[PDB]
Write a protein that binds this ligand. Structure first.
Ligand code: A1CGO
Length: 330
């Protein structure tokens, strides 16, 4: 089997991407944030505290003839940005782009933190990291990809995120029309439960490539590119007037600037992030200070190849017995 679904930016900055997902019988379609940095499929629901729902579409298990309470199971998750959610668990039929999994754990939120409430466009998250990170207790549950994997034509999914435009998540096949050149594959460590890999270096604009190992994670659920402070300082030093602002929370730059590109290495290959992808716009409405899309990972504990980096590439998440990542230009 295969599936193919379009993923759409939630706003004009590509702060996140939503993909429609069918849950239950008859189908209830919710727009979920596909997240290769976590491993829980959770949704706003008829159980979510009413004051914490503000415009989201909810899953109502009592209206699904295939929903079953997973008795005694609870979940609770906290993400790197400080947001969180928790609740109980149903199993139900879940379909993405024509690919159907029966008996998928659908984690129903009873509580969500303010950042989820305030984002009316995101109805929940669909985790695509390794199932060892799933938070359901006392019986850990499998991700949608892990449940689908044996049925797929090939044990893979691909992320093809657009810049200011829709893109595609495919399951079970690699669309050879969606990228240019060849795909370069690189090793993955699953020891932390992430799609963790080692970039071979970077360049700033037209500058020379610096060969240096940068361990980090491919995370579709993180907006920006978080890299070591040395690398980030070298980037922003090429932008007149750019500075790190403790009050704002990262590097800012004059909105009048033209940003240089940023290149990262995948083995001997190179992925170029155009300068425009690094512009996250005014820090507040009407400001002439703009927020940068490359930020320091110092204090996070891990480097994160988030959407800023991933949307410059066609990315293969290879879930074979030994997982690997593939990157191609597009
Ligand atoms: C850095 C970070 O926390 N990212 C993130 C936030 C919420 C959900 N998934 C994620 N991958």
């Amino acid at each position: 089997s295969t599936g193919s679904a379009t993923t759409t930016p939630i706003d004009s900055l590509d702060d996140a991407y939503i993909t429609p997902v069918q849950i239950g019988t008859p189908a209830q379609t919710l727009n979920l944030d596909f997240d290769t940095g976590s491993s829980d499929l959770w949704v706003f629901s008829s159980e979510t505290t009413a004051s914490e729902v503000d415009g989201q579409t909810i899953y109502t298990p009592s209206k699904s003839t295939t929903a079953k309470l997973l008795s005694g199971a609870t979940w609770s998750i906290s993400y790197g940005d400080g947001s969180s959610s928790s609740g109980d668990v149903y199993t139900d039929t879940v379909s993405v782009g024509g690919l159907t999994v029966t008996g998928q754990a659908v984690e129903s939120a009873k509580k969500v933190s303010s950042s989820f409430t305030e984002d009316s466009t995101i109805d929940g998250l669909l985790g695509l990291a390794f199932s060892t990170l799933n938070t359901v207790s006392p019986t850990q549950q499998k991700t949608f990809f892990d449940n689908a994997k044996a049925s797929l034509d090939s044990p893979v999914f691909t992320a093809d995120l657009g810049y200011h435009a829709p893109g595609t998540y495919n399951f079970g096949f690699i669309d050879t029309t969606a990228y240019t050149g060849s795909i370069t594959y690189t090793a993955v460590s699953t020891k932390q439960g992430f799609w963790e890999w080692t970039s071979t270096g970077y360049a700033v604009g037209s500058g020379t490539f610096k060969s240096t190992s940068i361990d980090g994670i491919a995370d579709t659920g993180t907006t920006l590119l978080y890299l070591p402070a040395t690398v980030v300082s070298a980037y922003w030093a090429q932008v007149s007037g750019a500075k790190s602002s403790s009050s704002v929370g990262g590097y800012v730059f004059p909105c009048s600037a033209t940003l240089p590109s940023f290149t990262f290495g995948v083995g001997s290959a190179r992925i170029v992030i155009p300068g425009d992808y690094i512009d996250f716009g005014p820090i507040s409405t009407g400001s002439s200070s703009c927020f940068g899309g490359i930020q320091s990972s110092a204090g996070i504990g891990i480097n994160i190849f988030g959407d800023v980096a991933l949307k410059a590439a066609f990315v293969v998440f290879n879930g074979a017995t030994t997982p690997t990542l593939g990157f191609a230009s597009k």
